[PDB]
Amino acid sequence: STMIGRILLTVVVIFRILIVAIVGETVYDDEQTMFVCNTLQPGCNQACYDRAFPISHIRYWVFQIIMVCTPSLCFITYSVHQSGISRFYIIQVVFRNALEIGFLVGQYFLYGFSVPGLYECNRYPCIKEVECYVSRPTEKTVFLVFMFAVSGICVVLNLAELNHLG
Amino acid sequence: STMIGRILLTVVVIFRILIVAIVGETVYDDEQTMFVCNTLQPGCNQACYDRAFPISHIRYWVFQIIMVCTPSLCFITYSVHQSGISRFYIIQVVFRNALEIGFLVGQYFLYGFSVPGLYECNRYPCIKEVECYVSRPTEKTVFLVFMFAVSGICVVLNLAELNHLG
Amino acid sequence: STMIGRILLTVVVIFRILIVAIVGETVYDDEQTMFVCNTLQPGCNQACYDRAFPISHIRYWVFQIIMVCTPSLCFITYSVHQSGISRFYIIQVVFRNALEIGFLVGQYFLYGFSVPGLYECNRYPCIKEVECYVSRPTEKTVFLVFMFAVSGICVVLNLAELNHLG
Amino acid sequence: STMIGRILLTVVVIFRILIVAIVGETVYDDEQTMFVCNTLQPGCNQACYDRAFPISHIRYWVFQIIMVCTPSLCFITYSVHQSGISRFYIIQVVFRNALEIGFLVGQYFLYGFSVPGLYECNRYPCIKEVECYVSRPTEKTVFLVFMFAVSGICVVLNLAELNHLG
Amino acid sequence: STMIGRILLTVVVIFRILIVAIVGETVYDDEQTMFVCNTLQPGCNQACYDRAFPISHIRYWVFQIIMVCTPSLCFITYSVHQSGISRFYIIQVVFRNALEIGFLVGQYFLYGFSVPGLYECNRYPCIKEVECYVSRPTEKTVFLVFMFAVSGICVVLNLAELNHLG
Amino acid sequence: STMIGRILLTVVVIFRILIVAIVGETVYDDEQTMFVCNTLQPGCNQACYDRAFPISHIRYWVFQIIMVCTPSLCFITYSVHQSGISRFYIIQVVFRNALEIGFLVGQYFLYGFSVPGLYECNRYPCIKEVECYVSRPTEKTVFLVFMFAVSGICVVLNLAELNHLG
Amino acid sequence: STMIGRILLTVVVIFRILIVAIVGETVYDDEQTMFVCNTLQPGCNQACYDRAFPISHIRYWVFQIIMVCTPSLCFITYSVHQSGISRFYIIQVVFRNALEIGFLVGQYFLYGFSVPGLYECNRYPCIKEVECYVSRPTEKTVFLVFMFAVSGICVVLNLAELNHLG
Amino acid sequence: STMIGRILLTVVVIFRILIVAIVGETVYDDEQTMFVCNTLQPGCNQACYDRAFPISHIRYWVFQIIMVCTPSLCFITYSVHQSGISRFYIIQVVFRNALEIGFLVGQYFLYGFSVPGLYECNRYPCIKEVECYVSRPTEKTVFLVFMFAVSGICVVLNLAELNHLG
Amino acid sequence: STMIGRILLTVVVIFRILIVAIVGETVYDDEQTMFVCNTLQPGCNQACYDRAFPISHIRYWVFQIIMVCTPSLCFITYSVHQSGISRFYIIQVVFRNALEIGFLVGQYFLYGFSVPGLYECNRYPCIKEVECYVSRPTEKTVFLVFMFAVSGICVVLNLAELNHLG
Amino acid sequence: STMIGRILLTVVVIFRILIVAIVGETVYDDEQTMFVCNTLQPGCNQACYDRAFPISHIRYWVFQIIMVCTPSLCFITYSVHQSGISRFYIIQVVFRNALEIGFLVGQYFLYGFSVPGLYECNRYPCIKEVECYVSRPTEKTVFLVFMFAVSGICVVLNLAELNHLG
Amino acid sequence: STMIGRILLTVVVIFRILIVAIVGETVYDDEQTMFVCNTLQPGCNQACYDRAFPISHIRYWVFQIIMVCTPSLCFITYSVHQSGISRFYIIQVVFRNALEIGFLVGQYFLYGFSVPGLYECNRYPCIKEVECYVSRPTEKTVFLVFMFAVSGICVVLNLAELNHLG
Amino acid sequence: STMIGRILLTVVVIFRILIVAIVGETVYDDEQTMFVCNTLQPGCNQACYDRAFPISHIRYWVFQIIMVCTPSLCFITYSVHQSGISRFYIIQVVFRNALEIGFLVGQYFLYGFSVPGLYECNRYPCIKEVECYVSRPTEKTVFLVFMFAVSGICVVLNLAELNHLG
């Protein structure tokens, strides 16, 4: 039970890392090339796209993945240099859990659960309101939901382990 | 007989992995660049293509390959950390077989056995119905049939081994 | 005499693999981008190209290379797991020879020995018959002839070894 | 207290290097392709872009990262060749700190803290003043602020260690 | 004297291999994209370019490099499998020398010593004679001369060694 | 004093190699794509660009880097094969210094110290004289000056070591 | 009363002739130039326009005007050549009235009372059904109604005169 | 006084007719060719222009000019055929005055006194609201005001004559 | 009867002349501008159109109209100069009738009774067979039939008069 | 002397009318078609041209010509209707002279004596200031000067006659 | 016999004048707009067309028609002013005949009897030889032959009259 | 002799007027549309064309024709108003001769005797010098020479008459 949780967490971490590394970059290759808007004003596309996607999904996910692994690096380097251990273990576990929960909440509040095909853009220099068409909405939505589920499972396992330790 | 089946399964797994890794990406490089439709309405191409191919073949196959290999990773990590084995072996074999059968059925119900050259698209903003032309139908069809045959052979071997174990 | 044949076969296999891996991919990089036809009908290019080159040369050659190496993998994995050997050796050699001969015959019946520069395309939606111009005919022809010669030499060596063993 | 500082510095260095190497290159892939200006004069784009971004962010950051690691290489090679050590250690630490502070000040005086979307270009051959639209302002601004914060933390840690040693 | 020649030959071989691998591909990346002709007939570009460069320089040089190294592979594999040596040594030296001389003569008779900027193309479907403009003539000429000099030095050293052995 | 010089030289060599390998290709990716001229004559761009940049900077720098390292390879291979040493050491040092000085002088006489934005092209087929606009002048100028300074420092160190040895 | 009818008829005839001659030609100058359809198939515009407007309004109105004036020419030429008069007068009046009524009925059954802006075209070679946009619908509708009213008034006056004569 | 009014009216009528005939057509020659809108939707131009200018100025003015001259034609033809005169004179004058007043009021309520340069168009198929730019606003405004003044003077003179007659 | 025929002939001649002069030119204004073909070969349009319409309808009809009126001019000038009359009258009438019959037969054998929308063109430089789309088929067909009927009526009247004279 | 002035004035009036009617329209045929501006903003051309040429020269000159001839029409119609003469003559002469002087002053204050080739346009929607190029400056300038001289001569003659009458 | 000749000549002159005036301009309206050549060099069209058609047919025919009628104008004006007659008549007839014969010979030597569709143009700036396609060859050829026949008939009649007079 | 000269002058005047009226406009219809230059700078065409042809030939010739006929109008109007004659006759003859000579000299000094096909334009905004290609050089040259010859003949006849009068 308690020992299994660590194995499950490690396997899930490896699985999510592999998924993000393999099927992450190529899906978002043509995000801006295929983004088009129904207007003739030069420079409307850039402003509308920037308003639509302030920070791409892949950037946020890669940053989260790199950030959640800092405690392991700190522990490994401390152990290597050594050659309050319980205090360090507790502190690192608590910090990892807090960071993961915060990142999950931020992700939920940033992107939501859908990527609508049509967007309304009304920023300078675009005149009045214009309509812009997104590329690949369905695949992006599926990937969003999948990543959210994986993160939720990770958070649940971490909370269970923390509760068990007490 | 029984011992040979494991070797055949491993060889087939390696072969399919190599095929997907080598002749998987470059075939689907220009899926959206060369997809064209007979209309002048801006944004019709994106919607029609999204309706035509919700999730590309390569993403589904890569996800299936990664998912079917999780039990091996779990077994290896558990064995490494160790330094009910029969129960774990039976459970992971059963889970792998069930996952493979489910994925095969899902693949059959998603794509079928053909990739027609011409498609009819009647989604917003395209007015009424329009005709769109796919790129590389024959090669995609051949690859679909080949992958289906490989998956069927794998399922048959797994079922035979499970029946033998009893 | 007999002992030299194995070394010659291994060297030839390595040489052909290196050639296919090094000068294979980039020669066929712009097969579809530079393929043009003399018409204005949208979608004629896709259908005409698909009719011209059902399965590209590189896919066929890579598949053949991967397929002809399965017996070695099977033998190696069986030997590793072990720690009728003569029967297994004979069976694997015979199967390899049969597969190679079949693949050579299929290649000869598929592509032939030339790649003409001009092609006549009369498939829907192209109206009546149209003329399409291929890219890089001479280099493709030279590569075809070279690969055919290499495969013929391999087949000759395998047949000689099989006859010697009897 | 003081001992943990070295571990924190090493972890931060690894983290910043990983971030720059992973999420740095592809963000600035289309800096010039998507840079457009509202004019018809040929060659205005080149001059205006060159005036807008004399030296891109990524080149500066890579150069800084490479430069701040020379003292470690010098120390390692000197130690290897050997097989006033304290004086050498003090000199290398002081030089590293001075270089880092100088680079941080230069970065602050070069780019600032914002990347405006609109720019006014009045260089030859562009007639009078023209307006040019930048691509991806928000993500670049976020990256700038993040790198500045990381560099500030590194400088603070180095100054604290130097004060502790004295 | 005699012993130095082997070291010189090995160093020259490594140097030429590195040069071809590093500054070989990127120079010839845009050979066909930037090749333009002064006409409006569709398909003239393909035929004229194919007539201009039947086989690119890089393909010929890579093939020569791979072909001249087969004797070393044969010797190494024979020695490995062993665990008439003089006869094999003499035979492989003679074969290498003959192959190198033949390849050098073929290169001289194929391309010559220059790459003219302007070319005259009079092949179907181009009407009458047309003029086409090559890309990067000077750099290609310099590379041709450099490779010819390197090959000449290699041939001279091989001939000297063969004469010394007698 | 004298001993530190070797460490400084090795560190500088590694630093310059890393700089050229990392920030070398990216800057010169679009040298010809973004080079434009103010005319309508087909083929003027190719001739004008070829006249502007006979041999790009990166090719020259890579060739120099590879050439200056041949003596080390020769020494290492000779030492390995062995298992007048002073004469060989002196000879290879002298040759390295001479080659470096010659390459530096050639670089100075080829490119100079600036890359002007505007160029005047008067070669066939361009009629009379035309004006062409370069891409990224400032960054190229900075890189030129930086490489010149690094080469000067290397030459100074080599001359100092040679004088010390006498 | 009876005498006034002839004056009113003549004035109305002159008025309609002047209107058709002055504001007729230039209103329909750009009927085909500004007619556009939402498709890329070549030749769809011609077929769709031909289906939309088999015979333009101006042709029909000019033909009617010329045809209704033949009896006057016949009467004038007969009178001139002369140098049953009542029978000729009655016959030509009856024929004029019948022709006018027939032409009015034909006009009503041909065009109706409106010119919709949007039209649906499904004729070869247009694929499936396409939408085409007409130019100047409102002005054409107003002109149609005005001409219909004028023709109705003329018919009423002619019928009244015929009834009065008895 | 009373006799002068008729001369003034005739002179003004001739002057306005000459103005409309000479500077009427060519001013409005390119009304639709130079009308442009800021959008990419096909067919938006036609609908937006039709909404902007239902009936052009020239058509209305020509129709008014032709309509106000019918009484003179009726009087002339009646006099010619003759070879209650006061009643006919009074009736024709009253009808002419009433028609002129009605046409002036209609003109005022239709077009107003200005022709703005920018218009907002929100009709199908144009998506949402778009902005369209008119051609030659100032000249059209001046012509409108001039014609209104001429019509007002004519109405004033006619009213004065009618009052004088009593 | 005998006298009325001349009046009918004169009226019909005037009517046909007016029709040809009024609704003849502007119908055929854009015969070549709107003629399009489905190909990319330059110059195919000119050859295909020339093959489709050797001599336009309007030229033939104008020439026929001018030719059929020469006898009247000859008679008038002879009468004027005078200041065998029956022989001259008979000769001119017979010649006019013969010319009209010949022209009618030629017209029937040239154009026929229809103007198909689609045409097949296989003349140099057009490659193989191509399809071209005509403009305004229905209106041209109606005009053809109308002119044929008018010419037939004229021929019938002339034959009747000739038979009556005997 | 006094009597000759009338003949000179009439001849000059006829000459100017002929010049304006013959060489006036064709020069100003392409005023707006060939007017171009150095920008990409849609609708900038219309606003800039409208600001450059509020009322074209030809409209002003035609209006002046028509206006200066009203007194002659009034006198002729009054004389015709008649079948204080000195008072009418004096009034008409004074009014004609005043109108001509006012029109000349207005022309001088409107256009001046030159038509510069380059213009600076800074009206909405044109961003900032843009430069626009006029068509045919020299011919327009010559015509302006010629018309000004003719008008000056007419004014001088009219003033001389008025002074003579006293 | 002789008397009829004058009538025939006058009728033929009127007929040819009418033909040239009616069906002369519209045929040659788009001579240069539809003239196209197979090249990309700017300015080749102008030079090639100028070489193809130095002086168009219509200009030559109009000039000939005007020139051949000068003697009649001279005779008429001399007779009018009067209010050696035989000598003047003979001189004018002889001069007219000589001019007509000279013009016919010049026409034959200029254009010939055909207008080939394809032309070869090899004038500056066109490089080498290019092929250009003419518009409307058949109709132009027919018109040429018709005009030649008419001129021949006129010359024959004039020669017959001159011989008769002697 | 003397009497004939007047008739010759009148006939020549009528002939030149007819030539200028008939073959004057059609030749110069596309002077600016077909004028092209070899550059991409916007607005270069306008400036270069304006420099090439400050005042077109047709404007100058029409102005000369109108100016040379003023004396006849003055004489006719004076004679009509009449209902020193020798003095007026002599004065107007002398003025006509002087004006004609001055206009001929001006024409010779303006245009010369040729219209070259290539022109060099070096005016703002065109950068450096550019080459521009004229349209229809040969026909314009022929027309120039013809008009010069006609004017010379007129001048010779006028001088002869003036000398005869004495």
Numbering used by the authors:
A (entry chain D), B (entry chain C), C (entry chain B), D (entry chain E), E (entry chain A), F (entry chain F), ...: 19 to 101, 194 to 276
What do the paper's sentences say?
To investigate the possibility that the pore-obstructing densities correspond to flexible NTHs and CLs, we performed a structural study on two Cx36 mutants: Cx36Nano-ΔN8, in which 7 N-terminal residues (residues 2–8) are deleted, and Cx36Nano-BRIL-ΔN16, in which 15 N-terminal residues (residues 2–16) are deleted and the CL is replaced with BRIL. The cryo-EM maps of mutant Cx36 GJCs reconstructed with and without symmetry imposition showed similar pore-occluding densities, indicating that the channel pore is obstructed in the absence of NTHs and/or CLs, likely by lipids.
Connexin 36 (Cx36) is responsible for signal transmission in electrical synapses by forming interneuronal gap junctions. The direct connection between adjacent cells is made by end-to-end docking of two hemichannels (termed connexons) from each cell, each consisting of six protomers, thereby forming a dodecameric gap junction channel (GJC). Cx36 is mainly expressed in neurons and forms the major component of GJCs in electrical synapses, playing important roles in cognitive functions, including memory consolidation and epileptogenesis. Here, we determine cryo-electron microscopy structures of Cx36 GJC at 2.2–3.6 Å resolutions, revealing a dynamic equilibrium between its closed and open states.
